[PDB]
Write a protein that binds this ligand. Structure first.
Ligand code: CUZ
Ligand code: CUA
Ligand code: CUA
Ligand SMILES: [Ca+2]
Ligand SMILES: [Ca+2]
Ligand SMILES: [Cl-]
Ligand SMILES: [Cl-]
Ligand SMILES: [K+]
Ligand code: NA
Ligand code: NA
Ligand SMILES: [Zn+2]
Ligand SMILES: [Zn+2]
Lengths: 586, 588
């Protein structure tokens, strides 16, 4: 006997116990929440353009974004935190972009996106998860959509021998591609084991069909299992091809005339399986059945025998297939031996015992279902605290439901997502809070307060603006002290320190048509004194926090006097923290 | 008064938060302080496609080229001094705009770039007899014309202007040249008078100069005189704008017909009309006071019956260090933020007036510590004659240690305070992003929203008229219209299928995709994303939305529905096939 009775109220002056990192959904950012209050503490821009901080306008952010800075949109789903020895290490958060086929890395000490990659030769990065052991060496990313190779407009047939999609491994630390594995069918979600050897992905379109009926044709799709060690061996030996103009090593993980690749095994699993979730004890890849009212449990410790050819049938690694309810989509873990699965149709979370399910699969009459909790309504992902680690603590569960209906005040034709906080600390799940959220966050991840360590003020050597420091060095500028205007043809490079309540350069004059770069270094040492910079009627806006250098470039296409001002309330004299750009005509 | 909204309970109020430097408007439930919706305005929203779609770019006009805004001041339209729930208006200081949000669909439906001005900051609405005008301050003095021949703020043609916009048409109604500059503004409860604070009577550009004068002022506008002069045709126009411009400057110590200047210390900031209609209350900021302007002494002021403009001041209570903003409980108490002392001070307005006449009396009732450095504050219904004295939100600029560390950039702290009693009680710390400066609350029953669009809605009526030139019935048609190097795809959609699931174009073609969501059920929002083309938008029930992009890449390119709509959402996809340029006629 043990009751679910955790406190959910965080009053004024008290602090949350966990960080929550929510996907921004179709809006493209990442959001930091406090748990259990469920309040949003910060927004981290990634694929969106943020007016407030200038992400997508500043030179530092556009440098990180590369050519994809031309896109103003992203579509996020799956946020994950880097691990060492199967425990969160607080270093990085990674997230997908389904719309423009990217992966982004967030540095959790500064809470900013610091690296971004467009995955080559694929369309739509959706499923995403991290290697656990011995650390997050790879980020594993699913490209969802089958395309021709090359995709040059000669062939559109998705059944062509060179039409396929690929599993993607990105080097977590350099954020360069590591390798890609061609697969049969398509990819939905993915997860990794607790050794570094195996990873797995559900596939819903084993039919390689383009119509909805054609995609639900097979009684069984599969989860494809990857022998990452075998892939690495082939890469070290130079046994790969490359595609197009990408140097990324490409391995062929498809079945050929019924013959298995060395890199993959295809395990039959019903049906359009969706979630692919690794239990915190490291025993199982659990695939949610979706169109089948089941989950399929793959025994990770049978995978070595599978790849060695010691098992008679790939179905032999399946050790449980519990029947749970209608529309199972995703699974999470309390660390006590239970799994928690969302039932999209029944609109519930079902708590079930994994080892009891395994015994039932063998024929024992044992009820593995512990409880079903109604949620409101149509849940997709769910997430228990530390569930992706061997420290899963069984304290909090968030279920992310797609249809909020009447759970909040009406706000027009568009509705919020309902992210419901559930106490799982005791024997009985208890619903404690309804959290409305914008643009369908879809999935989220939690970390203990003591697993995250952030900077109070920037380091002057920070790589985030190192390229700007280098520019300054070429101009002979000391960013910590200088207030100078550099003239170079029709290019003007203004450098200034800023400290509330005065810009270090309070006026400058240019010629109509000049290309103006303004570089600002906030030389305050006081935490929380953020500064801003806005050029009126020129589309220019950015943040400069303490000890940060930020820069932005725009053309002075309008003659006359044009004001700039500090946007971040920084001082009692904030309204008066302003300057003048004077633009001479021809 | 219940503080917590449990699962299945609803909030009692809507809150409309300024999005600050991030540029949107946010809808919260009060008292839970949870965000229920985001309404894109000056930001580009990946999720709904605002700033990408043809409908939204049509509304933004030429300013669709800007990806930023800087919001401060949301206000709800009124009839006879009470909110009527029709419209929300908000400022853009960064690119000099005013936007209107329709509160039935919770979208921005109109936007205007205010001509011949820089930086729209202060904004407020006429109260009586209804919101005929939106009043908006341009903060910064500029040359006229601003053609780069003259830069001097002291020149006789350097000035800023007060701006009145027609609330219903969202066209300019008039502009009034002022001395000094303009910070915040409010309006009376008759329709005759509006008022604005000024902090730069010195017309300087450096920090020292802007603080030189012991007093600046609040400028008072006689709107009846302005309208009369417009009907009489006694006005000029500036540049290409047809907006009537009236001159409200002093000339050689003689007042204009349109304005009076009441000296107020010092770099005053907030300008707030008491809910009983009695006072314009100016927050003294660099002066540890507020200045109370007796609205019923204004007619005499404008008729020469008073010797000194200061004679309309009937109170000037000493409150504390750095007064910025004032609000009202409807019980005769005012509440003022003290930025430096980091408090909310509750004070009785009638007793402050008594003390100004020398009657020794302590008008200060309570000082509540807030965390930290508060800017604006808002009490529920404070802008109307129904000010109900229930909730107060103070919007503080430095949250410091009140929330978990999230790196060098901190959230703002918007603190909900219970004022239903004699003692202010702090009940909730609400962190927010990008500095909402201000917010406005409305009772649940003051807001009525639509769940399904009407097919004739003006938001996409331009799109309906485009479709008709192509012979298209948007409610039924799934057609690919070709027109040179332009391709216009029209489709219905209803979960989980697009009505056009594939189409073929030539490389370089300009493709417009128009989708009409013909579902009838509430909350089946659909989406549309073209992979690797920077294309994303929302289509809600009965809405038509459209988006235009160049098919610049040969090959097969998937599109998919982004908004979860169905159990078969994952499979609601389509294919754009782009034939390569080398297989079609070659152009340079
Ligand atoms: Cu722009 S100021 Cu006190 Cu309104 Cu926040
Ligand atoms: Cu510097 Cu506000
Ligand atoms: Cu239609 Cu998702
Ligand atoms: Ca299938
Ligand atoms: Ca002054
Ligand atoms: Cl998953
Ligand atoms: Cl104000
Ligand atoms: K702040
Ligand atoms: Na990169
Ligand atoms: Na307009
Ligand atoms: Zn997902
Ligand atoms: Zn899912």
């Amino acid at each position: 006997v043990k009751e679910s009775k955790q406190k959910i109220h965080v009053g004024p002056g008290e602090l949350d116990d966990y960080y929550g990192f929510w996907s921004g959904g179709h809006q493209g950012e990442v959001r930091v929440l406090g748990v259990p209050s469920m309040r949003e503490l910060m927004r981290i821009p990634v694929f969106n353009v943020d007016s407030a901080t200038g992400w997508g306008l500043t030179n530092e952010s556009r440098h990180i974004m590369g050519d994809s800075a031309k896109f103003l949109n992203g579509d996020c789903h799956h946020p994950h935190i880097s691990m060492t020895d199967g425990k969160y290490d607080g270093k990085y958060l990674f997230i997908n972009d389904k719309a423009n086929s990217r992966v982004a890395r967030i540095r959790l000490d500064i809470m900013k996106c610091d690296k971004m990659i467009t995955v080559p030769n694929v369309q739509a990065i959706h499923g995403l998860r991290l290697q656990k052991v011995p650390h997050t060496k790879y980020v594993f990313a699913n490209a969802e959509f089958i395309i021709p190779h090359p995709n040059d407009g000669k062939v559109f047939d998705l059944q062509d021998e060179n039409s396929y999609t690929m599993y993607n491994a990105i080097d977590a630390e350099t954020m360069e591609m590591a390798f890609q594995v061609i697969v049969d069918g398509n990819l939905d979600n993915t997860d990794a084991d607790y050794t570094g050897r195996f990873a797995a992905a559900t596939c819903y379109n084993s039919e390689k069909a383009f119509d909805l009926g054609g995609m639900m044709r097979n009684e069984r799709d599969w989860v494809v299992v990857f022998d990452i060690h075998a892939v690495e061996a082939a890469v070290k030996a130079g046994d790969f091809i490359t595609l197009g103009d990408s140097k990324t090593p490409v391995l062929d993980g498809r079945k050929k005339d019924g013959k298995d690749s060395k890199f993959t095994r295809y395990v039959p699993v019903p049906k359009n399986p969706h979630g692919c979730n690794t239990s915190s004890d490291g025993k199982y890849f659990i695939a949610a059945g979706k169109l089948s009212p089941t989950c399929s449990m793959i025994a990770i410790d049978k995978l070595p025998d599978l790849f060695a050819g010691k098992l008679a049938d790939p179905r032999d690694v399946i050790v449980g297939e519990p029947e749970l309810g209608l529309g199972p989509l995703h699974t999470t873990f309390d660390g006590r031996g239970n799994a928690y699965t969302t039932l999209f149709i029944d609109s519930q979370v079902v708590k079930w015992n994994m080892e009891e399910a395994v015994r039932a699969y063998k024929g024992e009459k044992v009820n593995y279902i512990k409880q079903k909790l109604d949620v409101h309504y149509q849940p997709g992902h769910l997430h228990a605290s530390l569930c992706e680690t061997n420290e899963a603590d069984g304290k909090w569960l968030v279920a992310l439901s797609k249809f909020s209906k009447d759970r909040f005040l009406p706000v027009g034709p568009l509705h919020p997502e309902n992210d419901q906080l559930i106490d799982i600390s005791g024997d009985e799940m208890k619903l404690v809070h309804d959290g409305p959220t914008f643009a369908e966050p879809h999935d989220c991840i939690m970390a203990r307060r003591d697993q995250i360590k952030t900077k109070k003020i920037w380091d002057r050597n920070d790589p985030f603006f190192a390229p700007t420091v280098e520019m300054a060095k070429k101009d002979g500028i000391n960013l910590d002290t200088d207030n100078k205007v550099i003239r170079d043809g029709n290019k003007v490079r203004v450098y200034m320190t800023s400290m509330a309540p005065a810009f270090g350069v309070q006026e400058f004059t240019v010629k109509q048509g000049d290309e103006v770069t303004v570089t600002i270094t906030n030389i305050d040492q006081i935490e929380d004194v953020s500064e801003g910079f806005v050029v009126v009627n020129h589309g220019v806006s950015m943040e400069i926090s303490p000890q940060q250098t930020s820069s932005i470039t725009f053309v002075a296409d309008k003659p006359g006097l044009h004001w700039y001002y500090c946007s971040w309330f920084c001082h009692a004299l904030h309204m008066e923290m302003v300057g003048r750009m004077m633009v001479e005509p021809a």
